[PDB]
Design a protein around this ligand. Structure first.
Ligand SMILES: NC(=O)c1ccc[n+]([C@@H]2O[C@H](COP(=O)([O-])OP(=O)(O)OC[C@H]3O[C@@H](n4cnc5c(N)ncnc54)[C@H](OP(=O)(O)O)[C@@H]3O)[C@@H](O)[C@H]2O)c1
Ligand SMILES: CCc1nc(N)nc(N)c1C#CCc1cc(OC)cc(-c2ccccc2)c1
Length: 165
């Protein structure tokens, strides 16, 4: 029914941790740059909590916030209240990025076509997790080692998986 590619954009640790106390458990500037490079010029779909932690519209992209609050408004941002409303708003887009957090990854899980997942080789303390996925009929189409240096102190890899459909 929907015609845009639904891509997930996520960074997770060895136990699928993505969050701690409503923030990111790590700091990787190089991984963020990969995120900016990959998502530039495409809509970002983000959970209300995710968006408010970010705190500002991200430039050069449609910012779409997902909330059950029908009175919710943010300057420079679009607001959706369901999967279908997101699909309506993005009906003419070629590709959209589900940008988190966990509730929003769970929401859009039945529809994901492409997975950009950074895997961080460390076990952090956390409270928020990326959902489990059955990767049957998916293929890894890209993999590369992230930059580990003084400013990026963990080992991590970029992975991209595409659904076979
Ligand atoms: N490592 C990563 O790649 C990454 C990426 C993104 C986020 N995170 C982290 O993950 C954590 C946030 O994730 P989270 O799961 O707590 O929050 P979230 O998914 O970003 O946002 C949750 C909110 O989304 C809205 N929502 C949920 N289900 C909905 C539905 N069915 N229909 C309409 N709206 C719905 C609700 O907003 P309302 O309450 O306003 O109704 C809900 O409170 C933070 O720690 C963040 O830093 C990590
Ligand atoms: C950067 C890890 C990350 N990596 C990957 N591979 N996917 C993701 N979805 C996220 C994520 C996230 C959530 C997040 C939280 C945040 O403040 C609390 C700021 C930004 C941000 C700030 C400036 C520009 C772009 C994004 C993103």
């Amino acid at each position: 029914h929907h015609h845009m590619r639904v891509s997930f954009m996520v960074a997770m640790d060895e136990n699928r941790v993505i969050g701690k106390d409503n923030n990111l458990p790590w700091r990787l500037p190089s991984e963020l740059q990969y995120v900016k490079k990959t998502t530039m010029g495409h809509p970002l779909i983000m959970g209300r909590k995710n968006y408010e932690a970010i705190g500002r519209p991200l430039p050069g992209r449609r910012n779409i916030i997902v909330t059950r609050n029908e009175g919710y408004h943010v300057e420079g941002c679009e607001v959706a209240h369901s999967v279908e409303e997101v699909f309506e708003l993005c009906k003419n887009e070629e590709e959209i990025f589900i940008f988190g957090g966990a509730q929003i990854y769970d929401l859009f899980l039945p529809y994901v076509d492409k997975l950009y997942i950074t895997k961080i080789h460390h076990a952090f303390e956390g409270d928020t997790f990326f959902p489990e996925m059955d990767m049957t009929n998916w293929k890894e189409v890209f993999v590369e080692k992230g930059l580990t240096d003084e400013k990026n102190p963990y080992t991590y890899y970029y992975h991209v998986y595409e659904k076979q459909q």
